[PDB]
Every structure is written in C-alpha cells, then in structure tokens.
Write a protein that binds this ligand. Structure first.
Ligand SMILES: NCc1ccc(Cn2ccc3cc(C(N)=O)cnc32)cc1
Ligand SMILES: NCc1ccc(Cn2ccc3cc(C(N)=O)cnc32)cc1
Lengths: 248, 248
C-alpha cells in the first residue's frame, strides 16, 4: 500500500456481517469514503455465509428453550471471527454491537479510536450465542437504547464516529462537552429572520463569547444533565448565569 | 401501487441527503429491504445538488462570524425540503437529525412510528442555518451523544428502528424495559461451555422465569438506571431479589 497522505495513525477495521454491501454507505461516500481512498481507514468484511458447508448456506439456528426468533448459527460465525483475527494479528479488539452493550458516547468513541485495529461483529436475528460473547468478544457496545434489524448500522455508526479521530480524515465535536451554538449562512435576511448582528461585527472575541454563551443556554435548556458532568470554567459560569438571567 | 401483503399501517419516509445512494444500505437488504419490496415502507430521496443553479452545483456556504467549517447552503436545501413536503401532502412531520436533538430511545421510536409520513433532513458539514430549523423543522432528534460526518447514518438508524413497528415488517425489543436474556443455539457443548439445563428442560414456565430473572440480573449489573424508570411486577421484584442474593 502507497500514497502521499500522512497515515501515521491509520485504522484497520474488520467487519463480520451477512450484509457486507451495506458498508458501501461509509466506504464509497463523503469524508469516510475519502479516508478509505487515502488509506487513512481500511474496512475489510467477512461474510459468515462464506464459512458455511451446507447446500443452502444456513447462517441462522434455533434458540434452545424455544422462542419467537432465530440466532446466528455458531459454526459459520465462529469461523468468520477466527479468519478476521488471523488477518488482523495480535492487538485487534473484537466488538459486538448490541443493545446490552456499553452505551456509546463521544468519550467512548475516543477510547475506541485508540485501537489501531478493531473487529466489529454484526448480529442479525435475535442475536448470537452467549458462549461466543464469553470466548470471542472483548467488548459489547450499544449506539443507543433502541432495537434495530441488525448490527450493521451500529457498526457503520461506530466506524464513522472513530474515523473522525483519525488525523487527516477531517478537512469542535461536543466542543467543551456542550451542545453546538446556532449557525447562520447566506442570506442576511430569510423570511424576515436576520442573522445576529454580532456574527456580522468582525470582532472575533465578542463572537467567541456569544457562541459559548449560546452553547451553555442551549445545553441548559435541552440537556441540563450534560452540565452536571462538567467543571465549568470561570468564563463559562459567568456566561451561563447571564443566559439564565436573560431567560427569566 | 399493488400486491397482497397487508400494508394497513404502511409508512412513507422522505429523505433530503447529498448522499442518497447511502440509503441503499437499508432499502436493498434484509428486513428493511423486504419492507420496501412489499410496500410496507417507502423511502423517497431528494438531493439538494439537484436544486442548485450554478455551474459547479454548490451545496455548502460559509458561516457568518467565521469558523473552521462550512454549512449547508440555504437555497438548495430550502428548495429540496419544499419539494419533499409538496410530494408528501398535509401530515408529513419534518425531522432534523443532529446531536442538539432529543435523544432517541425506543419510547421515542414508537412515538415517531405513529406518523404515516416523515421527512428526514440529513445535515453535512457543521450543519444547517438556524432559521431553517425555526421555519422548516418540526422536530430535532439525536441517535446518541456522538458526532458523525453527516445525518445519513442517523436517518438510516431512525428508519430501521421505526420500520420494526410497521405491522408485517418483522417475520420483544427491550421486552419489559429490560436488557435481553442470554441466548444459546447449537452445539450443546462449545469449548467445554454448556447450555443451561433449564433451556433443554422443555418446561416453558421454568424457562420464562429463568430468562426474566437473567434479564433483571443483566439490567441490574449493567444498566441499573434502567430499573429506576420501571414499576416492576411482583414476580419481577421477586426474581430481582433472588438474582441479587445469588450474586452476594
Ligand atoms: N433479541 C433482541 C434483539 C437484539 C438485537 C437486535 C438487532 N441488533 C443487533 C445489534 C444491535 C445493536 C443495537 C444498538 N442499539 O446498538 C440495536 N439493535 C441491534 C434485534 C433483537
Ligand atoms: N457542528 C457540529 C456538528 C454537528 C453535526 C455533524 C454531523 N451530524 C449531522 C447530523 C448528526 C446527527 C448525529 C447524531 N448523534 O444523531 C451526529 N452527527 C451528526 C457534524 C458536526
């Protein structure tokens, strides 16, 4: 592999999925597409269908104890995992995406971004055998408290979020642990609604302060619990107090 | 439109995205692919690139007040939105995906699933003008407290999660508000690890109770805060107490 782009901190991400072609949504488009093309980011997929030996290529199996749903068939999933780890070498941490996992947040994205090598195991049906979690999975993660039709979109979300921490991928994110300020672009006036004059002012320091005050007001009004995790700066305590006083 | 599949509660979801081909990950594969093919689910995309008039088809614009990033250019995004609403008719609620939004959870998925018609607006760059949120967006939602390279994966996650609530899409999800029990499938013994005998027992009622006890133990050990939102049943208080006593 070759090219001119500093790829010092490049990431390799293996994927186990019955729907590998879904990952085209991240590998062929936009910033993540650029990361793949410039060898900042490598996503390599294995399909458990390819690790079957029966005529029909069965990748699901019946739960012990009855139930409504299927699970991922152990042998083809176990084999796909073992092939991904052999390709990867020492180091590669294996992640199972599931709703039973550690809740992903940006802090967790930056821990996950320290790994040079991830293997993301995508579950379909009602999930995978507990013994494979025990013996093959380093960490279980959720992207959030909702149920989806498989692990692919969780895995794609994880990939995109860690890719942003790869130096060179971007061309800030929960700046200061707060929600973002309002943004404006052209035109000056839109449906009789105008851009805050301060943003037209040219004064970078009065603009820094307006954005920070707005972030604090917006975190306060919508996600108060996010303030509780922060030791606010003296400036931040002052702008928050002010925004609260202009509310009342 | 035609076919034999009861589509009583069918959903129509408009999408505004500069990368419409990303939505192929949900419309051409698996359960969501089946929903689209059987007319349970319709995803229709508009690209703001198509609503440009300049030679180069500019879809980004400079923030007022300076900054590192671009925003979505207002005119082509505003026009794409207005075309999606005209196609949709009365009713269609417009959603902006962003980290500043209401946090998605399964409860929120079932509120969102009541709409027969959604329009999902996907932001790229540092986001969209505040005046369009004011005048075009009914609701702002986050899939979680992490920053991504655009709204597409959030929008795809939202679509997949609401699709599951469309009668006929599936072939339970935070059953009882708890994490899932362990599952097992073949083989009986795997790396010297065996399936809980109870799951082999045939006794449906002793199995119901083991799964529920395990859900409560697993919610307790990993997501205690999820218990606080619940009024547990008498049976649930009893199985939780027992699991806590077998821990200590
Ligand atoms: N038996 C219950 C059941 C669990 C999981 C699924 C699908 N699914 C797979 C991986 C994953 C992650 C998430 C998330 N929140 O990360 C959600 N759904 C997921 C379906 C049924
Ligand atoms: N200026 C800050 C900034 C905000 C948003 C993005 C990308 N992005 C668009 C929509 C969206 C939803 C989420 C989520 N959590 O739903 C995350 N990122 C998203 C990039 C920078």
């Amino acid at each position: 592999s070759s090219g001119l782009v500093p790829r010092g901190s490049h990431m390799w991400i293996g994927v186990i999925s019955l729907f590998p072609e879904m990952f085209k949504a991240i590998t062929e488009f936009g910033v993540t597409g650029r990361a793949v093309k410039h060898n900042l980011l490598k996503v390599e997929c294995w399909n458990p269908r390819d690790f079957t030996f029966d005529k029909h290529k069965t990748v699901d199996d019946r739960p012990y104890g009855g139930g409504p749903g299927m699970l991922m068939m152990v042998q083809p999933l176990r084999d796909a995992i073992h092939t991904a780890k052999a390709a990867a070498g020492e180091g590669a941490k294996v992640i199972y995406l599931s709703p039973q996992g550690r809740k992903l947040d940006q802090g967790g994205v930056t821990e996950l971004a320290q790994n040079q090598k991830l293997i993301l195991v995508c579950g379909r049906y009602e999930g995978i055998d507990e013994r494979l979690i025990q013996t093959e999975i380093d960490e279980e993660w959720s992207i959030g408290d909702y149920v989806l039709t498989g692990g692919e979109l969780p895995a794609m979300t994880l990939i995109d979020a860690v890719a942003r921490f790869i130096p060179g991928v971007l061309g800030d994110s929960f700046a200061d642990g707060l929600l973002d300020c309002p943004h404006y672009t052209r035109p000056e006036v839109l449906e009789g609604l105008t851009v805050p004059p301060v943003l037209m002012s040219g004064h970078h320091e009065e603009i820094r302060k307006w954005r920070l005050k707005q972030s604090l007001q917006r975190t306060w009004l919508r996600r108060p619990e996010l303030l509780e995790g922060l030791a606010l700066t003296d400036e931040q305590r002052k702008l928050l107090k002010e925004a609260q006083a202009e509310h009342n």
